[PDB]
């Protein structure tokens, strides 16, 4: 399609013919960019970047930049894996992984607003949003349809479950459970992400089954272990609820408590 | 005056002869820039930008960029209206409106510090300051001489009154009343912006009349409705106080409570 | 070594032969850059910048930019003094001083993460870290090995002592004492920076002597003045403890209280 004459693209970089690269953009070697991707002006794509189809990179976005980890050996070919249909706004910055078997990974249809940051070794699934100036520390994992507000600190090694929301001015130290909204410092689960769930087309029955799972877990005067047991012993559960139980069971750091 | 040879300026863009544009800056079509305006390096001015006189745009500032709204039709010619004598610091980012009859609007002599952000459909008057990294969400309205600190979240559709201040680490959910200082999360009016008022040359009588209006509204053990009534029934009021009453009366979301 | 043909370097600027300057970077006059320094792409180095050896400036870093102070006379040749082995990440921004005898000063081996900001007239010593999006207001002083988290506001004229840490979502209004960790809004000393101290190779005896100094100062039911007196009257103290006492004695704004 069109690479501006002022763009600096390493000859070894692999770009589909349709790829558009704007003025004063820099693309390094060991880069692959797939069909339909548009790179605007002053964008930098660093060595190790593997980018899918129909992605947009707005002015000044920087992709696959060195980890902000002082002990990292800068000589290593580490990677940034990006899927399809993602939007990287102005001056957003995605950092590569710290090990050869540990890329920074982004799936599909994610939206990274202006000046948002994804730290080394983060794994994000699909359809997530980081709002303006949002920062994700290294080693943070997002599922799908998660929402990260600006002015949020997430502790390394935390997981954020599907359809969850972290509101602004929050400090996250343990996992954010799916379908939930976390707020405050120190942060707590304050309720369900009803908007995300309605917007997603969850049926009233599905939303009420999610509400019922968390009533047992949080609002029944019993320990988390006791509550998960109660839920499993109650019969056939829907997938969303099985997922809730499994998220709690699989938690490394433990799961954020309820207000 | 001087457009650097490396600047990329659409032939349809309307620039007064005196306009200075620095190295590697991009100016699109449907742009008008008036006398005395200086654009530094790596600045981007997007289609729909209408810029007045004696404005300064520092390195990497981006003006009229797409709204960060997923439902917005990117095909529309929407606008960013900027008046005179404004300063846009390094990597500040001003987003255009979402409708043809709904520009993002900035008046005169405003100061946008490094990496500050103005969301789609914001309206700002004159002489406002957003400090370093300050973010205004879409649909936020500032009057004149308002002060927005970094680490502040303002809810969409909030109004910030004249000479008011929002201190750092604050979450604003209802209107910020004029001549006042708002702080905390959840935020409250904590007192009057006495510095802004003194700096502005408000007489002791004017400042005391403002203090007296808020004593009735906040510190008299009555409802807001009762208090505004009391004030109007008390005789001839100065303009500043009439404005206070009207601000409370005209509030869409309601006005932030007092600590 | 290599200055890219597209770099714009004022002929009066003094660069050691080994200095590497990347694509579309701007270096102004009244600049001096010493041996081993690498400047990446789109970097701006402003007049008054005096840079030492083996510094790295990542893409879009801006150095010696005008103070964000409205009363500052932009005609003055004010300075930014940077030592050796510092790292300035992507879109970090260092502002120059406001007086001819008042530079912004950075020592050695400091790390400024992406989009971090150093205000006019800050003085930083050696080995400090500002994390992603960290902002230091004008006139803030850091010693050595201090750690500044993102989402922190530090009041002008505050000192941050050696090996201290300010955690995220904190508002600093008085001095941060050495070897300590400050947290919250309003902020308090919450404990000792044991990690910084262990990482630094402080002996168990040295760390326990520091803990003992603060037990007297904070946890003995007496005033700060009384406590410092008690410590000095207790005999021969190690340097780290003498420093603690002196930091408290020399405090302009006073020192942050303990939780």
Chain A nearest-CA distance from C248, in A, is: 29
CATH code reported for the domain at A192-259? 1.20.1180.10
Q: Is C85 tagged catalytic?
A: no
**Pairing label, strands B80-82, C93-95:** unpaired
Instruction: Out of B121, B162, B175, B183, pick the active-site residue.
Output: B121
Sheet holding A32-33, edge to edge: A14-15, A32-33, A49-51, A80-82, A104-106, A123-124, A141-142, A159-160
Nearest to B24 among C24, C133, C169 (CB): C24
- Contact call for C59 and A70, based on CB within 8 A: no
Nearest to C70 by CA among B113, A180, B78, A133: B113
Nearest to C133 among A60, A66, A133 (CB): A133
Instruction: Out of B138, B143, B161, B196, pick the active-site residue.
Output: B138
Report yes or no: C46 and C29 within 8 Å, Cβ to Cβ.
no
The half-sphere exposure of C233 on its side-chain side, counting CA atoms within 13 A, is 7
Chain B nearest-CA distance from C43, in A, is: 10
Report yes or no: B223 and B257 within 8 Å, Cβ to Cβ.
no
Ramachandran assignment for B70, one of left (phi > 0), alpha (psi -120 to 50 degrees), beta (any other): alpha
Q: Give the neighbours of chain A: at least 3 Cβ pairs within 8 Å.
A: B, C
Q: What's the rounded Cα separation, in Å, for the pair C49 and C82?
A: 8
Q: What's the rounded Cα separation, in Å, for the pair B159 and B254?
A: 10
Q: What's the rounded Cα separation, in Å, for the pair C49 and B25?
A: 23
- The residue extents of the domains of chain A are 1-191, 192-259
Report yes or no: A44 and A10 within 8 Å, Cβ to Cβ.
no
Report yes or no: A52 and A83 within 8 Å, Cβ to Cβ.
yes
Q: Does domain A1-191 have CATH number 2.160.10.10?
A: yes
CB-count burial class (<10 Å; 0-12, 13-18, 19+) for C221? exposed
Q: Which residues contact C234 (CB under 8 A, 6 or more apart)?
A: none
Instruction: Out of A85, A119, A121, A161, pick the active-site residue.
Output: A121
Nearest to A153 among C42, C91, C150 (CB): C150
Nearest to C62 by CA among B65, B60, A59, B117: B60
Q: Do domains B1-191 and B192-259 have the same CATH topology?
A: no
Report yes or no: A119 and A95 within 8 Å, Cβ to Cβ.
yes
With the CA atoms of B37, B40, B45 and B50 taken in that order, what torsion angle do they form, in degrees rounded to the nearest 10? -10
With the CA atoms of A111, C60, B121 and B29 taken in that order, what torsion angle do they form, in degrees rounded to the nearest 10? -100
What are the beta bridge partners of residue A180?
Answer: A192
With helix as H, strand as E and coil as C, how does chain B read?
CCECCCCEECCCCEECCCCEECCCCEECCCCEECCCCEECCCCEECCCEEECCCCEECCCCEEEECCCCCCCCCCCCCCEEECCCCEECCCCEEECCCECCECEEECCCCEECCCCEECCCCEECCCCEECCCCEECCCCEECCCCEECCCEEECCCCEECCCCEECCCEEECCEECCCEEEECCCCEEEEECHHHHHHCCCCHHHHHHHHHHHHHHHCCCCCHHHHHHHHHCCCCCCHHHHHHHHHHHHCCCCECCEC
Q: Is C133 tagged catalytic?
A: no
Q: Is A121 tagged catalytic?
A: yes
What are the beta bridge partners of residue B112?
Answer: B88, B130
Q: What's the rounded Cα separation, in Å, for the pair B45 and B24?
A: 12
Nearest to C21 by CA among C65, C56, C64, C66: C56
Report yes or no: B36 and B53 within 8 Å, Cβ to Cβ.
yes
Tell me the chain B residues in contact with residue C155 when contact means C-beta distances shorter than 8 Å: none
Please state the separation of Cα A42 from the chain's center in Å.
Answer: 24
Nearest to B171 among A41, A59, A169 (CB): A169
Cα diameter, chain B: 67
**Which two structure tokens, joined as six digits, stand for A190?**
């304050």
Nearest to B14 by CA among B52, B65, B67: B52
Q: What's the rounded Cα separation, in Å, for the pair B183 and C171?
A: 12
Tell me the chain C residues in contact with residue A26 when contact means C-beta distances shorter than 8 Å: 23, 41, 59
Question: How many beta-carbon pairs under 8 angstroms link B with C?
Answer: 59
Tell me the chain B residues in contact with residue A149 when contact means C-beta distances shorter than 8 Å: 153
Instruction: Out of C121, C162, C175, C183, pick the active-site residue.
Output: C121
Q: What's the rounded Cα separation, in Å, for the pair A51 and A63?
A: 10
What are the beta bridge partners of residue B166?
Answer: B148, B182
Instruction: Give the three-class secondary structure for C225.
Output: helix
Expressed in Å, this structure's resolution amounts to: 2.1
Mutate to test the interface with B, among A132, A153, A199 (most CBs of B within 10 A): A132
């Amino acid at each position: 399609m069109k690479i501006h004459p002022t763009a600096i693209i390493d000859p070894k970089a692999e770009l589909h013919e349709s790829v558009e690269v704007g003025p004063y953009s820099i693309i390094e070697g060991n880069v692959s960019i797939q069909e339909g991707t548009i790179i605007e002006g002053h964008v930098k794509i660093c060595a190790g970047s593997e980018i899918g189809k129909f992605n947009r990179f707005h002015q000044g976005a920087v992709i696959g930049v060195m980890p902000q980890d002082l002990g990292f050996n800068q000589q290593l070919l580490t990677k940034t894996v990006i899927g399809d249909h993602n939007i990287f706004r102005e001056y957003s910055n995605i950092h590569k992984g710290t090990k050869e078997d540990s890329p920074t990974v982004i799936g599909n249809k994610n939206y990274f607003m202006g000046n948002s940051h994804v730290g080394h070794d983060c794994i994000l699934g699909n359809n997530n949003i980081l709002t303006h100036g949002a920062v994700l520390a290294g080693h943070v994992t997002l599922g799908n349809f998660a929402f990260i507000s600006g002015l949020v600190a997430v502790h390394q090694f935390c997981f954020v479950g599907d359809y969850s929301m972290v509101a602004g001015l929050a400090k996250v130290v343990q996992d954010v459970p799916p379908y939930s909204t976390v707020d405050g410092n120190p942060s707590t689960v304050v309720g369900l992400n009803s908007v995300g769930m309605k917007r997603a087309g969850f049926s009233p029955e599905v939303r009420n089954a999610i509400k019922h799972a968390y009533k047992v877990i949080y609002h029944s005067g019993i320990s988390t272990r006791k509550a998960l047991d109660e839920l499993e012993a109650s019969g056939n559960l829907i997938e969303q609820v099985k997922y809730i139980i499994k998220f709690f069971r699989d938690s490394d750091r433990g799961v954020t408590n309820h207000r």
